[PDB]
Each structure stands twice: as structure tokens, then as C-alpha cells.
Amino acid sequence: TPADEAREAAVEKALAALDLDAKARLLSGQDMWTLPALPEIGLASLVMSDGPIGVRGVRWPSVALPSPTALAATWDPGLARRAGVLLAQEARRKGVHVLLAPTVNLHRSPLGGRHFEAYSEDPYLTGEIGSGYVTGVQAGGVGTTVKHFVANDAETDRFTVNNLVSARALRELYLAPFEAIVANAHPWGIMTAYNQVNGSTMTEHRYLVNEVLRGEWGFDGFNVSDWLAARSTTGALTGGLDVAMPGPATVYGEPLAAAVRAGEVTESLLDEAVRRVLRLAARVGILEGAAPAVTELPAPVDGEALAREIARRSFVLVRNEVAALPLEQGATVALIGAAARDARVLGGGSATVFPARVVSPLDGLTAALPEGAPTYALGADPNEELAVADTGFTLRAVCRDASGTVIGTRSAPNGHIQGVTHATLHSVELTGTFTPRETGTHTFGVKGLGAYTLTVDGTTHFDGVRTTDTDDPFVSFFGAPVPLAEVELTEGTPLEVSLTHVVELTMLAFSLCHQEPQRDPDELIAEAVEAARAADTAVVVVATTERVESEGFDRKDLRLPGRQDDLVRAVAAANPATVVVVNAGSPVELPWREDVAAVLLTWFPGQEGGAALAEVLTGAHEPGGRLPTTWGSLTGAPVTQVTPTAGELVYDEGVFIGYRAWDKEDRTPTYPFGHGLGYTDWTYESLDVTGTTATVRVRNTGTREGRETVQLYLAPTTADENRPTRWLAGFATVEAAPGETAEAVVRLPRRAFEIWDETTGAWVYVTGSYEVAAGRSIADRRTRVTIEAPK
């Protein structure tokens, strides 16, 4: 803390200069993304933006990386550090100061909405990756808000739900990754969640925010509310909140200025909170008078290359039978499935961005394979009932005032929408022309809320409203699009399409949606089976959509959308050498494993996914992924409750989530935590533990050079009603050529032996004999040793 002392001196001078009206103003938001500026003290407007896979800015493109679970499947916090560096470069370019990322809530249930956005079901692996990600983002002088503090491991009724979580459960599981990132990475900020934990809402939670996070862990950054989570001027200030950031009319500002002057809300409390915001201002560099934390920035990073590297390093090859992968030299390959032509690179929610261009599996494999590239056949379409209007749509974004007079025309990206306009703007048209690809009944819709008027070819097909009873307006926007009208358009012949939204009195975004005309599912699977029959290997890319996987709501089942499961079985029957490329962000049921030759989980693999998949399938590279979460059937899954009964979600499983819960119940999953295969064999030959330092020698006993994640699992020798049977206590990714041997000196944290004392309010190093085991997964433990926990 050498320059930090000088920096915190400039913060104190700035705090002293400001008056009560400016102090309360600063803590209140200005726009959807930025805070007010104060030239009286040389402070610029703090720009904040989403998020985990890419930086959006203020919608005025981004680099779309693979989903957060994909980054965690690489088991490499050095990759997460590099990922963070690129994101800081993106933020510096888009003028963003704070990145609203990473999400580190655990994978409690497989039905969780933002499951694709979290890293793992294990708090150690989550903390390690999160630590790397934050250190990397802040390495480029860009702030981070570790979201969603704490216990936001489900989306239904997230606005009000009371998540009743145990004392040990919070300390050992849900809070762990936050403590790990606070201590290791030193984050400049945090975000408090919409839900409540044991009574208090996270934004108003005095015990967890001020006493635990700040008091025990020594957090020195700012605490932003989740967008619309701030709901009390006095309740949030006293509960450790600093910034009510939903938008312009926040709970802070003039209501807070008044509460200080009139009520028993002390100006000392306001001063303590502004001090935190002004400390952030100095680190991100928006405050003149305090030098920025990172002055010399990290060397430029190639965004496309890192997106490909993270993508292939995460692909978990769970199944591979005799050797389906990699593909053989000069083999006839057939690509099947809609997800191969139109890939799903991002998951739904605020984490979405628009990349420059996306490489699809068919684009990638066409270039990778020679003359007579993959024979493509769409097997089934998962992206229905509706999808954003893009293919064949040439749209503009017209702004109108009260008199309907045009006051601007922005270029439409495709259908979504959010210049020299202001409170005068009354409505927003989204006109254009649409050339249909095939004749039939085209449906048109919208994903938005409020007043809408649709006119496909002059005729006003819709002119009504779209209200909803839900407690959260964010659930409403990213909900499935609503069909407004069916229309008969002949292919080739285009017509003038138009969708207007009237705006007046938070709510400010809509998108034109369109469904391609009817396609028989059974005939689609018939034409794909002919291609499966006409090939040495069939590659079926199966995927969950942004409508299935998204924020605001939870999934209903782990089954694949559309007739995709029925497509896989038809292809597996016609051709035995079938490779299923699962492009899903969360666990999904694989009922046809026994029939298919191979399975490869690719998550939502970012804009370069198609290039990484082409490299892996052809054998240019190896799939370097190892499950960061336990995959299995929903019936076998022991912790699935996402829905709150009587407005309460009890976490009855306690300290047992993910693999810990499967062990406690005897239920064995389809593929366990840490499972994954590459394109080479690994023989663990030596394990030496000295105190708490495990040293592992592993041999590449395969035909090709490859990577291996060494996974150390601690397990008490005695019975453990109080604890899980085994748990991850360390890991390390090593690379070696065939025959060559690599070592791994992995130190197990002191914490791996400790448990939480609810009464003392302290950690308890559990003494006794343990079994430290090195392996390829939890189920594939290769070598064991018995040690006494050191003093």
C-alpha cells in the first residue's frame, strides 16, 4: 500500500470538497450504465457495462468469448487471467471503467437459469478461476464487480425469494468463492443480488456486506446494487450499499440527501460510502488529482486467437469409442443439425454482446476438410417457436417525437434495439423490407413490453399492449418472444415490414422477431438420415437456445429443445460412427450415449467456436476440457429445487451440492466432476505429499503430445456425517510429448482441511488422517497416499 496511501489522500481531499447535495448525487446513477460527473473535483462520469464474455459499452463491436462455464472447464486460472486482460482492453476501447463481471454463484441445481454464466459446483475451482479473471481485468486498469453477492443460485422469483441458507453452508460454499477472490485478486468492486438471505435483501444485508465481506475479509471496493435491487434509502445505506445503479431515478440522490438532513441517517455514513466510490474513481482513473492504479497497460492481445484457444481448451470430450475422434484422413464427413449452420455462441441475458463475425461449425469444417467439404443436412431446428428477425431483413431504427415527426434513423443491427434525442422522443419505429427465403406462413413477433403496432405490408396486423404480472421487468424483456400475427409471403417477393413502440414512463428496449415458414420435423430427420447413411462418420451438432438458457427464469427440464433427441437416435441407428457435439451451456440429458460413438460438450463457444471445433474434430488440436460440474439425469440429480414455496427457498442439502450431494445419496452421475478425455493416455506414476504439498509425476502413454489436468482429492479416513466423503483440494494442467513425463507441485490450501464453527465465528482445522488422491476425475482416482493433517 505505497501509492495507495497517496491515492487515498486525494480521495479524502475530494470527499472534503463536496457538499451534501453532490455527495448524495454521486451514489445515485445517471443513465442505464453511468454515474454523474463532478468537474468541481475533477471527477469524470463512471461508465459501467456487461459483462462476463465481452464488453458491450453503451450500445455504441465486442469480442464474444466462450461462456463462463467453458472458461472454468479449461481448469486453467492462467487462461482466466489472459481472458480478463483482453476484456480490460475491450473496456478501455469502449470507454468502460468497470466491468459487471464475473458471476461466481455456485451451480447448486442443474435447472438454474444463469447456470451457463457460473463457473462450477465446487467453491475452490470457482474461486481459483474467478481470482484469475479479476486479476487479469484489473491488470488493464479496469474495475470489476464480483456478482451476485450472495446465494443467487436460481432465477425464479429472484426479486423477492428468501433463500434460507445454513451458517456452515454460506461460509463453506456460497461465500467461499467471494472470499477467495477478495483475498487473492483484490477486487475493486462487488454487486449485491436481488434475492434475500436469511431475511435481509442482499442490497440491505448489514451482516454479510459490512461485518463479513468488509469486516472479516477486508474488502476495500465499492458495492453496486444489481439493476433495480436498491429498494430503501436508509435500509440500503445502513446495509452496506454504495451505489443504487438501476438508472436515473434511484433510491439515492435527493431522497438520500433528504434522509440525512431530516432523519437519523448520519452524514458520516454517507461519507463512508462516498469514500468507497471515490477510491474506485482513483483506481479506474476517472478522478484527476489521484493517479490511476494501472498506469502502464499490458501488451496488446489478439482477441480472435484467445477466443479460439479458450474454446478448444474447454471442450469436454466425455465419450470416445473405438477411436471415433479425431476424424480420419480423407474420410467422408456429414454435418447435421441447425446448430452447425447457425451456431449458439452466447447464452441469454445481460451477458450477451454482438461479436464482429462468428465462425460456425460448417464454416470451420468446410475450410478444414478438402474438396467435397461436410455434406450438410439440417436435422432439426431448436430455435423455435420464434427467433430474432435477421435473415432477409433490411431494417432502420426511426425515432419520432410527440408530433410523429422523424428526429433520427440509427442503423438496425438485425432486430434488437435499446442520437440527438432526449425526453422529447415519443416512439421508435423499426421499418425495413423482408425478402422471404421460402413461401408459406411467416410469423412475426416481439420480445419487449409496452405499446406495439406491427404492419407487415401496410396492413396493421397488431396494435395493442404487452403487460405482465411479474415482480421483475428484466424477466419480462429476456422472456421468449410473443407471436403477434401470421402472414402469407411468397419467397423472393419482399414486402415493407414495420414494428413501432410508444415510450413515455427503466423500460426502453424491444426486438422484431420472425419464425421461418413451417418445416416438417420428420422429413428433416429423413433427409439427415440419408446423409448419415452416406458418410464414414456423422457429426450432429445438438444445442440449447438463448430462449432455453437465459437470465430471469429457470429451465423446466434438462431435455434438449425440439426434435433434436429424436434426430440423434435416427442418425445413430443409420450410422454407428456418430459424433454428438453438444453446444449446451448447462447440463443436458444424453439418453443416446450407448448408441453414439462419441460425445463432445462445447458449451456456448464464442465467435471462434466453429474454428476451434473444426481444429479439434480434424485432430489439429485436442479437446482440453474437464467437467467443472457433474452431469446427469434430473431424476438422479439430488439437488434440483429452484422454485420457492411460500416465498422461501430452503437450502436443506447444506454443505452438500454438486458432487458432494451425489456422494451423500449413493447416486452416480452419467459423467462426474473433473471427467474428460483428450487424444492421448496418461499414467500417474508417483505421488509424494510433504505436509500439505503434493508432488505428482504423470506419463504421456499415448501416440500424441497432449495436456492433462491433475486433480488432487482430499478425503478423511474416518466417517463423515459432518462432511463430504471426498472433495477437490488442488489441481494443475501439465503438457507433455509422448513417453515424456511431467511433474506437478500442487499445494493443498489450509482451507481444504477446515470447516466453519457457527458458534465461535471462526474456521476449524480438522486434524486426523486423510487420503490425498491424484487422478483424472473424482471417479478416476489413480494413486492414493495417507497423511496426518499438519500443525
Side-chain angles (χ1 to χ4, degrees):
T1 55
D4 275 76
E5 274 215 297
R7 196 193 324 287
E8 272 86 291
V11 167
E12 288 296 345
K13 275 278 157 68
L15 225 183
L18 270 89
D19 65 305
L20 187 276
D21 292 293
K23 291 178 182 164
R25 190 200 303 160
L26 183 51
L27 307 195
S28 178
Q30 198 188 32
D31 311 32
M32 176 69 177
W33 305 118
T34 178
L35 295 184
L38 308 171
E40 51 260 56
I41 69 134
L43 181 66
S45 195
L46 180 78
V47 179
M48 279 156 283
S49 168
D50 301 322
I53 68 163
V55 188
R56 306 167 76 168
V58 296
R59 197 76 214 178
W60 75 52
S62 320
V63 160
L65 285 172
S67 46
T69 317
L71 172 60
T74 77
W75 284 62
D76 186 356
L79 265 183
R81 195 208 106 78
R82 233 198 298 171
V85 169
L86 165 58
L87 285 137
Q89 303 196 348
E90 289 268 289
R92 272 133 52 193
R93 175 171 72 76
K94 301 215 176 192
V96 183
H97 300 99
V98 167
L99 186 63
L100 304 173
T103 310
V104 308
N105 293 97
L106 307 180
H107 289 144
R108 180 184 169 278
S109 162
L111 298 165
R114 304 174 95 155
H115 201 286
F116 69 91
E117 202 180 308
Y119 292 140
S120 175
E121 74 194 20
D122 182 64
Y124 179 74
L125 181 68
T126 301
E128 289 290 75
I129 279 127
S131 288
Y133 185 96
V134 169
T135 52
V137 173
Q138 307 200 139
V142 166
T144 35
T145 54
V146 192
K147 67 203 211 151
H148 300 276
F149 190 85
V150 57
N152 191 268
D153 330 280
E155 299 296 284
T156 61
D157 301 330
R158 67 181 172 164
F159 219 64
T160 60
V161 64
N162 180 30
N163 292 316
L164 294 157
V165 193
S166 143
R168 286 216 323 167
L170 283 173
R171 289 277 186 170
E172 293 189 49
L173 289 161
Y174 309 99
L175 287 161
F178 291 104
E179 189 196 1
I181 300 162
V182 166
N184 300 352
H186 307 309
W188 296 346
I190 199 144
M191 182 171 286
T192 33
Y194 301 118
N195 65 270
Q196 359 184 126
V197 165
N198 306 352
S200 270
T201 310
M202 288 308 318
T203 45
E204 314 191 18
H205 216 306
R206 345 210 185 285
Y207 177 65
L208 291 172
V209 176
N210 297 116
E211 294 165 63
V212 182
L213 177 75
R214 280 157 177 164
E216 299 191 28
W217 313 346
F219 176 53
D220 63 340
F222 90 122
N223 176 20
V224 69
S225 69
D226 206 338
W227 266 224
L228 306 169
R231 310 180 187 83
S232 177
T233 290
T234 79
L237 196 68
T238 53
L241 188 70
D242 292 333
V243 186
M245 195 45 224
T250 62
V251 197
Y252 292 170
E254 303 199 314
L256 181 154
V260 167
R261 271 147 168 168
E264 185 61 77
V265 180
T266 62
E267 194 178 295
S268 321
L269 225 190
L270 173 54
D271 290 311
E272 192 182 289
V274 170
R275 194 170 294 148
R276 303 206 199 82
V277 171
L278 289 172
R279 200 186 294 97
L280 174 81
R283 289 154 166 180
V284 308
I286 55 163
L287 173 74
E288 179 247 36
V294 182
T295 46
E296 197 45 275
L297 302 170
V301 166
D302 184 25
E304 297 161 310
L306 189 55
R308 236 139 116 160
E309 186 179 5
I310 297 173
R312 5 106 189 179
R313 293 268 274 100
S314 64
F315 302 167
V316 184
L317 176 63
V318 299
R319 174 176 179 86
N320 196 9
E321 300 291 57
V322 190
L325 286 158
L327 277 34
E328 333 78 84
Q329 294 180 342
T332 301
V333 177
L335 238 184
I336 304 160
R341 180 197 192 190
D342 288 286
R344 220 66 48 189
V345 312
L346 1 138
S350 48
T352 47
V353 313
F354 176 49
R357 193 170 257 169
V358 177
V359 187
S360 81
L362 185 57
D363 288 353
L365 279 174
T366 292
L369 303 185
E371 76 302 277
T375 70
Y376 179 71
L378 189 151
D381 178 61
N383 198 6
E384 238 73 76
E385 70 195 1
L386 274 155
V388 171
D390 187 12
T391 310
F393 286 91
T394 309
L395 318 185
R396 333 108 206 191
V398 195
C399 301
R400 337 297 288 269
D401 59 88
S403 80
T405 319
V406 174
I407 62 171
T409 53
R410 293 182 292 282
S411 181
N414 42 7
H416 188 47
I417 209 79
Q418 298 168 247
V420 192
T421 63
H422 51 281
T424 62
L425 187 140
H426 164 56
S427 49
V428 180
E429 221 168 70
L430 214 85
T431 308
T433 50
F434 170 53
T435 304
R437 297 211 294 186
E438 192 74 42
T439 73
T441 317
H442 302 254
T443 311
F444 295 94
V446 62
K447 47 185 262 71
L449 243 66
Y452 296 94
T453 305
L454 196 145
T455 84
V456 163
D457 205 44
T459 48
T460 304
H461 282 65
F462 180 79
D463 187 346
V465 170
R466 218 281 259 188
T467 301
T468 193
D469 83 321
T470 61
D471 55 350
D472 185 37
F474 280 79
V475 173
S476 325
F477 162 64
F478 229 104
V482 298
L484 298 169
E486 266 88 3
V487 199
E488 304 298 341
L489 326 177
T490 67
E491 77 193 90
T493 63
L495 303 180
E496 284 265 342
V497 178
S498 162
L499 170 49
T500 315
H501 184 356
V502 189
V503 313
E504 55 192 305
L505 221 68
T506 71
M507 288 184 56
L508 48 111
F510 71 93
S511 331
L512 175 61
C513 306
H514 164 253
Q515 131 187 117
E516 290 172 21
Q518 311 319 85
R519 295 175 181 281
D520 191 334
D522 299 274
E523 305 237 49
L524 274 170
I525 294 165
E527 301 297 281
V529 164
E530 291 180 35
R533 198 156 253 93
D536 297 324
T537 45
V539 179
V540 194
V541 188
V542 186
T544 67
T545 71
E546 299 113 353
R547 183 180 66 77
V548 177
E549 308 225 359
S550 168
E551 113 178 46
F553 56 93
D554 293 317
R555 288 192 294 167
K556 302 177 168 194
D557 58 350
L558 315 183
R559 269 257 168 163
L560 284 156
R563 272 235 190 171
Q564 297 181 118
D565 274 314
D566 302 335
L567 161 62
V568 170
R569 292 143 174 165
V571 170
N575 188 321
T578 288
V579 181
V580 186
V581 171
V582 172
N583 195 89
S586 316
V588 161
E589 301 232 25
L590 313 176
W592 28 257
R593 286 168 282 101
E594 306 311 348
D595 311 337
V596 308
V599 178
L600 182 70
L601 316 182
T602 67
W603 315 101
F604 296 134
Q607 77 205 109
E608 297 295 301
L613 183 57
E615 285 179 331
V616 168
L617 300 172
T618 60
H621 289 279
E622 165 196 90
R626 298 274 179 286
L627 284 186
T629 184
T630 290
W631 277 47
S633 72
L634 191 68
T635 68
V639 180
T640 50
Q641 190 71 59
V642 298
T643 316
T645 301
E648 287 192 329
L649 187 45
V650 182
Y651 284 41
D652 68 288
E653 69 289 337
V655 165
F656 300 80
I657 64 150
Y659 61 84
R660 298 170 175 76
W662 292 81
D663 292 347
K664 190 179 81 182
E665 302 291 81
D666 173 58
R667 307 196 232 193
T668 76
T670 309
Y671 296 115
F673 173 93
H675 162 79
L677 321 173
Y679 292 142
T680 173
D681 307 334
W682 294 88
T683 292
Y684 286 53
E685 288 202 328
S686 191
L687 167 57
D688 172 85
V689 184
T690 178
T692 199
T693 296
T695 315
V696 191
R697 299 178 167 163
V698 189
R699 271 257 317 289
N700 185 349
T701 72
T703 62
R704 39 207 147 194
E705 186 238 58
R707 279 247 169 194
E708 174 68 327
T709 316
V710 173
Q711 303 175 22
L712 287 149
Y713 292 98
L714 191 72
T717 304
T718 311
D720 47 67
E721 200 162 86
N722 49 349
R723 332 163 70 175
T725 50
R726 319 175 215 75
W727 62 89
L728 185 76
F731 58 89
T733 60
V734 315
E735 186 177 50
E740 190 172 62
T741 296
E743 209 163 71
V745 175
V746 187
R747 187 174 191 169
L748 316 180
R750 202 75 108 167
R751 182 56 51 80
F753 303 84
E754 301 171 356
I755 60 177
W756 180 254
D757 198 341
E758 308 188 17
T759 61
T760 312
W763 284 94
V764 177
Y765 192 92
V766 185
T767 46
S769 30
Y770 289 86
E771 292 156 274
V772 167
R776 283 202 212 166
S777 85
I778 312 185
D780 201 17
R781 296 177 315 285
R782 248 106 190 75
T783 173
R784 48 156 291 178
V785 152
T786 311
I787 50 80
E788 299 298 303
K791 319 192 200 83

